[PDB]
C-alpha cells in the first residue's frame, strides 16, 4: 500500500479525516488518499465478501461502477487503527465552495449547467441505492479543464430506503425543517431541500439560512437579482412540507432548467 502510491501534500482535514494528494506509481494517475481513524467511525457495514468495513466504503463501491459525476473509489486498505481510501483526483480542480467565494453569485447560465450536473450525479447515487445526505458546495469538485462536477464525501451517507430516517450527521444548515423540528425525514425529499439550498447558494453567493429559526421559517429573501423562473424553482425545492417539494424529474423538467450547456461548453465559456 505504502509502495503503490507516492504520497504528497495534505489537501484537507476535518470531520471526514485527512485527505492527501498522491500519485499512483503504476501509471502516474493523480489520486486522493483519505485516512479515517477506526475509533471515529460511527456506521459500519459489509459488502459482498462479507468483510466488515466503514459504510462509506460500502456506499462508494455501490456508486463507483462506470462513469459518473461522483468521485470514484479506486482502492482501499485496512490498517491496525485506520482505513485508507484511494480516490480519483481531478487536475486542475477547485471545490464549489471556494469557487463561489472567489467569483461571487454565479451567472444563471453557469448555475444551470452546474446544478444540472449535480442533479444527474444524485440521480446516479439514488439509482445505485445510495443516499448522500451531505449535498453542499463544499462536497462538490470542479474539473476546471473538462467543466465536470464531482460529488465527494459519503461519510454521512446511508443506503437509500423508503421509510423514515431518524439519524443525521450531515450539515445542519442544509438539513430540512422536518429534521430541525422532529428529527425525522425521508430520503429523496430531504435531498431536494438541500438542493434548493445549493441552488440559492449558487445564484446569490451564499446559502439563505444560518439559524434554526430561519430554516423552519421558510421565507426565502433574494439578496441578488435572480430571474423569476429560478426563484420559483428555489422556493419549490424549499417548500416547508416535504410532500410539496418537487421530484427530481419535476426539477429537471422545470422551465428554468431547459437548454443546459454541455460540460465542454461550460468550461470554455465560463472556466478557461
Amino acid at each position: 500500500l505504502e509502495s503503490q502510491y507516492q504520497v504528497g501534500p495534505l489537501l484537507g482535514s476535518g470531520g471526514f479525516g485527512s485527505v492527501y494528494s498522491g500519485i499512483r506509481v503504476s501509471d502516474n494517475l493523480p489520486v486522493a488518499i483519505k485516512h479515517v481513524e477506526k475509533d471515529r467511525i460511527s456506521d459500519w457495514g459489509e459488502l459482498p465478501n462479507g468483510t466488515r468495513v466503514p459504510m462509506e466504503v460500502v456506499l462508494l463501491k455501490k456508486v463507483s461502477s462506470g462513469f459518473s459525476g461522483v468521485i470514484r473509489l479506486l482502492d482501499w486498505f485496512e490498517r491496525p487503527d485506520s482505513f485508507v481510501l484511494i480516490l480519483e483526483r481531478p487536475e486542475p480542480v477547485q471545490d464549489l465552495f471556494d469557487f463561489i467565494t472567489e467569483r461571487g453569485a454565479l451567472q444563471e447560465e453557469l448555475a444551470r449547467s452546474f446544478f444540472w450536473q449535480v442533479l444527474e450525479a444524485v440521480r446516479h447515487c439514488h439509482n445505485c441505492g445510495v443516499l448522500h445526505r451531505d449535498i453542499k458546495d463544499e462536497n462538490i469538485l470542479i474539473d476546471l479543464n473538462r467543466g465536470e462536477l464531482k460529488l465527494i464525501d459519503f461519510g454521512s451517507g446511508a443506503l437509500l430506503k423508503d421509510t423514515v430516517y431518524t439519524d443525521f450527521d450531515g450539515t445542519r444548515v442544509y438539513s430540512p425543517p422536518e429534521w430541525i423540528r422532529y428529527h425525522r425525514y425521508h430520503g429523496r425529499s430531504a435531498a431536494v431541500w438541500s438542493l434548493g439550498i445549493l441552488l440559492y447558494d449558487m445564484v446569490c453567493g451564499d446559502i439563505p439560512f444560518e439559524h434554526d429559526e430561519e430554516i423552519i421559517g421558510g421565507q426565502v429573501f433574494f439578496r441578488q437579482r435572480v430571474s423569476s423562473e429560478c426563484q420559483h424553482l428555489i422556493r419549490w425545492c424549499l417548500a416547508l412540507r416535504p410532500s410539496d417539494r418537487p421530484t427530481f424529474e419535476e426539477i429537471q423538467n422545470h422551465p428554468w432548467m431547459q437548454d443546459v450547456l454541455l460540460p465542454q461548453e461550460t468550461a470554455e465559456i465560463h472556466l478557461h
Binding site: 470531520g15 450527521d169 450539515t171 445542519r172
Partner: peptide
C-alpha cells in the same frame, strides 16, 4: 457579509 464553511455534525 461573512460567508463561512459549515462542518458536518
Amino acid at each position: 457579509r461573512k460567508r463561512r464553511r459549515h462542518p458536518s455534525g
